[model samples]
Target: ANIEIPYGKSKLAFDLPDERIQGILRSKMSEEDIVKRALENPIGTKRLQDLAEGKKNIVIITSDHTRPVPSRITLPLLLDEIRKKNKSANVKILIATGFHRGTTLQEMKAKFGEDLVENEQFVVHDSRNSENMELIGTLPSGGKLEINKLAVEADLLVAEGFIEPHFFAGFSGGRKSILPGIASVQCILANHCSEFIKNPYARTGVLENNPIHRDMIYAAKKANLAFILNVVIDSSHKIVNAFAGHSEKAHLKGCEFVSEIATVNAKPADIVITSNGGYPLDQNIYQSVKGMTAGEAACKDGGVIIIAAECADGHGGEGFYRWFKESKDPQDVMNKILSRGRDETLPDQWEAQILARILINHKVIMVTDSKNYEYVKDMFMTPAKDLGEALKIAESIVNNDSKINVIPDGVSVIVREK
Candidate 1:
């Protein structure tokens, strides 16, 4: 069977026997009406004007550059509504960076747009700075919940994000903005502990029984999440559905709609090919694991996985490269880190741990550009010169009789055993 997968900015094409292939998983494109309707009709909730009726202060949390959420589109609409209710609502915007590096002013201009930020103050989240941090409460996990003082003091806490299948957090957006976005660095370490991460239920489209999702909800409730505007977008970046109002209900509604599009109910295949999509998503190998984890879930225990990514920035900059420098073997890296628990935890460590977990499960081969082939190989993953070569090698592992599944847009879709 002829197959094609997205590789960086280009496409990867190859051929396989029809008998050996299972299917090419794909989703329906979201109608343009979905975006218009979502913005017009936000669940069962009222506009920010009504929600912000008696509110003296407001804080709107938004996604960073790595995420594809177009907060520029959402924020203007939200600010308009807040203005309708109270022209002096003391509104502020917080770019939810989580533990990621503070976004540059130029980058923030890209996310929020220069036209919108001049009137309203906007700040990038810096979890490392305790000066802006305040302890809110304790968690069921014995972790203290700390978040940005600017957000905590706001009478109205509204957040904007796109809802999707997160590899571990069930879904992104909503409560995630509070925990990792504005939450202090130490607080993030609490919820992202290996105990929470390694849970079987901590997966995409699964909120109930998922410690990561559940803890986030607990933290959101504690942090007083008043309202949220979350959306489900298609692979083409069109909004398919938008949910607003009560944080939990609106988020759950958005997740349900996305679950239908994202969840792939397919039988396990001997060889699965997946990509982290391309461009910004595939900018780093650390982000590539989101795609890798899906293929890992769909592949048979000892099967091969072909991952296509363009690590344009290589092993996710300095933070991710350092872990590999400490130990090339993923198992060796995870063993030492998990042994010390959160004591030895550092930024970029979770990405390393998760990658190691996936690496041990399948024979992963990365089809990437030539410049970063060394980085791909350094992590002990097979680096293919091209798709033709990658598929040629997959044949050596499973031969002609093996089954195949192609996930062209990997991070956007979730595959599960049927």
Candidate 2:
């Protein structure tokens, strides 16, 4: 029996039981065990203590989804260790949010637990509030590289973050904590546009090879940054490996693990269906579109792509919303945004590029729960509604004999040819 699978612009014909696909995925899951083992590593605690030792001040850099470690578990544990070793009240923690807005108290409590936030030593890093952060020196590479004045004023500097497969960076860690995370607007634009678009990873974790990583390390060293505690997380958002020591050293170690597990190999598919999992991931349309990039990489030209995201917060980022409202055609919006200038503050530029590419070729559909779906329709002329309806519409477009691919978690990429 041929099963019908619907994608955006085309359909795939294939015969396979749902249970088989699910079983294949289950066999590949290294999430839980990886997380447990990574936590067992004593590096996180040791590094924090070593770096913060005798230091009167401290700052913790963390990403939004890059939680689970560094902040939730490592930060608190490290704080206790610091207090014990110092016997003084000088150590402090700041959440590094990059260009994103500071996380609210409730969000912090949800992520780090109430007890940690209530601690007088913990404060969220405010990138926008200039009163809270101080601009440090710029990178010789022409990157702004702004640091929290407080962090620079301190005797020692330490950073914490997760290492994962980044679209442009090869992997996220090392000097990243300084580049876009705490750097100045000028530095960010310069670095991001520098070799980033052309050679983002360059040498990657390799010493003296990766220009991007090298620049970041140089700037960080100039800032007197001492150590980095980086980790690798599996699909379930659990730490699978943690590294502590020099920025480059820890990042290289973490990259070894990340390259092994996070890397995906797949052929292009005719239709791709993906989801951002839920909530914070799909908080806004701009952020939620990351699924498109994941799909497009494996989607065939002229093939339709369906994005299954909850989009609870609707489209976000003022620039993205403005672009959506101002332009009626996706290509027009793309030209305007790309031509005028790329917003260094926006993390979704790559996603915007993907959307523009889709508009130039095949049809794209957004399956979301946003109340303002019509607004999205007006801007992109793509259908935006419930996943069930979207699937149905896709079925009508692609006949029963077409191939179909569905990625529930929106993390995996699968491709099949007809």
Worst 10 residues of 1 by lDDT: 27-36
| Local error of candidate 1 at residue 379 (angstroms) | 1.8
Error of 2 at 157 (Å): 1.1
- Kindly report which residue stretches of model 1 are placed more than 4 angstroms away from their true locations once superposed: 29-47, 317-329
lDDT of 1 by residue, 31-147 (tens): 434444654566656766788887888898888876778776778777877778687788889888998888987887787788877767888889999999998887777677889
The numbered model that scores best in TM-score is: 1
lDDT for model 2, please: 0.58
Give lDDT per model, in order.
0.79, 0.58
Model 1 TM-score (2 dp): 0.92
RMSD of each: 2.5, 6.0
lDDT of 2 by residue, 1-418 (tens): 2333323222334445453221111003354434334433533244455556687766655555334454576665545655665767476566666666667877877888788777646656656666655656655655445666767777767777887655445567777877667765545555554234434233222334456566677777776656676766654666656776676666777877665554444456566666654555666677655556566655668766677665667676566566656776777766654553323424444445545655666556787655757756854736655555665665566643345455544443221122
